[PDB]
Amino acid sequence: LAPLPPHVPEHLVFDFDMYNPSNLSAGVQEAWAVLQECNVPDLVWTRSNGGHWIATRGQLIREAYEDYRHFSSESPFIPREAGEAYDFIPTSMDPPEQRQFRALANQVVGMPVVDKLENRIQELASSLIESLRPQGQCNFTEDYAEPFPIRIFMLLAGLPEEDIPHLKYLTDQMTRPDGCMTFAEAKEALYDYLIPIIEQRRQKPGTDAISIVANGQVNGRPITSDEAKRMCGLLLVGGLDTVVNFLSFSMEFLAKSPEHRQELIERPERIPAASEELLRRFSLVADGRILTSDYEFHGVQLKKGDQILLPQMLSGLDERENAAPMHVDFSRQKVSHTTFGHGSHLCLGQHLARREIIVTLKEWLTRIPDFSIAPGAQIQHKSGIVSGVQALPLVWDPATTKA
Ligand code: HEM
Ligand SMILES: *SCC1=CC(C)(C)N(O)C1(C)C
Ligand SMILES: *SCC1=CC(C)(C)N(O)C1(C)C
Ligand SMILES: CC1(C)[C@@H]2CC[C@@]1(C)C(=O)C2
Ligand SMILES: [K+]
């Protein structure tokens, strides 16, 4: 715990540790939701992780993500060392500088790309699920949640499958550091990997996402190698450590809730709406911003260079946005959330994400309608910039499945 800065009033202190939250045994969303109990102010200072602000409510989270002039994305990760070294494109750039790079990224992950990739997504999902189906069990995290989205990404990026273990390791250090590498070291090693590949595909372009990004136009000129590198690196992080975690929270839920499963079994057309509700309830991202100036925000005095965590996860969990937030209701009339961010840096990968999520649920519920958590397994979660599931052993009766 870092010493309380003089400008922070004592009543605002709430020592939440985003990488190791107190109530994690209750579930990661539950752990973070302690920030929304009535004894916690809308904006608190934690002395954890070097010390930083945390907005706990949708209203503030959205406002802050909209006001980039006060809350710059130049340093979007806690701790400070990580935000300092963070230089991915487009995320580390404030408007309007980021727009040109978002456009370029949309050429590799935008809706049109996702629609043309849907056949491979379905293919891979079906193949993996059918391989699992007669077995009557799986380790969900390593048997599906990882290889499915990750292989689609590697296919899109035209990168070798044998590189997955190295890259997945590196991306996880940036989001959930185990202590072996600082964010800066993880980033530089990912850059080490990408540099020669980017040079080769600028010399001899293929048709893959890296070739497209590394040879695109920004700002009336060719993209530089350095920009290409910083953009491709963020695309790797997106591809390897988002949907990978989210599918496990969803499948854990569905394993544990036969009644919700039955809903989607009986009425498969609901799966898209259900997916969005799962996106709210099992939201998993938490980054933020850095103060560009002294600023009074909702009667709280913030100083230039204060960091503020703005957990995208919390907005949809806020009972001010959704009545009975912890309860899953597929029928929920307005599913309010900021699971995919807010403002100028809205997730670019969210169409790929949704398609992967919806393809997975529809195919799994068709082939393996009835499944459960393996006997006496206790599911443990993990927290960080992106939260996750440690392990998800699942079982089912192969005679109940359909080939
Ligand atoms: C469940 C899946 C996903 C979630 C929850 C998620 C979440 C988010 C969030 C919260 C942000 C805003 C970050 C900020 O403002 O600092 C963001 C931006 C971004 N996401 Fe995703 N994402 C997902 C899938 C993906 C995928 C699969 C990719 C890559 C294919 C991706 C690529 C990106 C990129 C490149 C940005 C930066 C956009 C910009 O800075 O203009 N996302 N995402
Ligand atoms: S109103 C929620 C709440 C906060 C705190 C004061 C910690 N509590 O004891 C309850 C659970 C009443
Ligand atoms: S903690 C073990 C370790 C440290 C570092 C030098 C970053 N590594 O490459 C490994 C993961 C072996
Ligand atoms: C916070 C994110 C999910 C978003 C895309 C990947 C990620 C870890 C970032 O650095 C920006
Ligand atoms: K930075």
From Swiss-Prot:
One of its GO terms (molecular function) is heme binding. It is found in: Cytoplasm. InterPro entries: Cyt_P450, Cyt_P450_B, Cyt_P450_CS, Cyt_P450_sf. GO terms for biological process: (+)-camphor catabolic process. SUPFAM superfamilies: Cytochrome P450. Pathway: Terpene metabolism; (R)-camphor degradation. Its EC number is 1.14.15.1. It holds the Pfam family p450. Its cofactor is heme. The keyword Oxidoreductase applies. Heme binds at C347. It catalyses: 2 reduced [2Fe-2S]-[putidaredoxin] + (1R,4R)-camphor + O2 + 2 H(+) = (1R,4R,5R)-5-hydroxycamphor + 2 oxidized [2Fe-2S]-[putidaredoxin] + H2O. Keywords: Cytoplasm, Heme, Iron, Metal-binding, Monooxygenase, Oxidoreductase. One of its GO terms (cellular component) is cytoplasm. Belongs to the cytochrome P450 family. Involved in a camphor oxidation system. This is Camphor 5-monooxygenase.
